[PDB]
Symmetry: C3
Subunit: 131 residues, 3 copies
């Protein structure tokens, strides 16, 4: 059965760090982000070329946060909107500071997500199994 874990984050908290801590705290071995309405005072993302990075200290509304949660690694992608309504996004890094964040995580106790090195990509990739 899918379980819900909800938590409000406050000013100054690091989004990615808080999610990783929540995952470890609840012994989550398989999960995803259900919702994350909120705002940031600092955005820090890795871009689509997998190398460039963007850090901006300005107000951003969090529109969506998607993530594959495993105990040892959280793969999170975010979409945010700036003061003009334009949307930006990419791979979530450390340093994304909350300005509230109404975080909701879905935990899948019956599953076990892990990550194993993939010679074809050069990165550790998702491996799905039953728990």
């Amino acid at each position: 059965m899918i379980h819900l874990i909800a938590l409000r984050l406050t000013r100054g908290m690091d989004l990615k760090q808080q999610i990783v801590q929540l995952v470890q705290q609840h012994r989550i071995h398989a999960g995803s982000i259900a919702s994350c309405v909120g705002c940031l005072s600092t955005l820090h993302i890795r871009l689509a070329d997998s190398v460039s990075t963007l850090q901006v200290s300005a107000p951003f509304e969090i529109l969506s946060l998607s993530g594959t949660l495993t105990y040892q690694h959280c793969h999170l992608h975010i979409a945010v909107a700036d003061a003009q309504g334009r949307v930006w996004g990419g791979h979530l890094l450390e340093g994304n500071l909350i300005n509230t964040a109404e975080l909701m995580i879905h935990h899948y106790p019956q599953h076990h997500f892990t990550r194993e090195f993939d010679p074809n990509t050069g990165y550790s990739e998702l491996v799905v199994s039953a728990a």
Copy 2:
């Protein structure tokens, strides 16, 4: 156990109003938006500076809708794409009119979300409790 509530919205309906009505109708005290594929004929959002607003009467595809649902308040953020594929988004206001909208809401009967004034923000913020 997480429950699903699905509803197709039709031309002219107000997105936010329909969600609020659904929440009250089903006595939802804790929930989130599972999905909302569809399109709008009018977009109306509050921007990241928390004051500016954008209203546009043009076709927009709804890409994602995230929300913290409580009986007395729905905090919704939307991401939409215009005719050129560019994405815009922000805090959902009244006035977002459906052009279909395939709405799916997740209800958490075991939880109770409320909102209490936060002197540190000046707004009512999410408070999570067990139901």
Copy 3:
């Protein structure tokens, strides 16, 4: 009870085709996209005017994927970010090729989603029923 189906997609796979195949394989008559963190080497979307289309062969990070899943039809909308962090999106078409894609689908065994022609729109639209 909501069920989770997770699958990692690899290089060259067609996103929409893989989702349709998963839906048919698991006899899903009602479902939605829970998460889809990943990246594409080719983007192909129908835009908000419901006619224009954009196909781009460049790296894109998948930020969010929303979809109404029925056995005979999957209505999917995607939001992706380019190498500069700018977000683009629209109605998912065939031809969106994976560069990984950590796909998670939620199946609703107690529901039955179908699509029936709507004279008011000219398209087949979502009809929700109990299973």
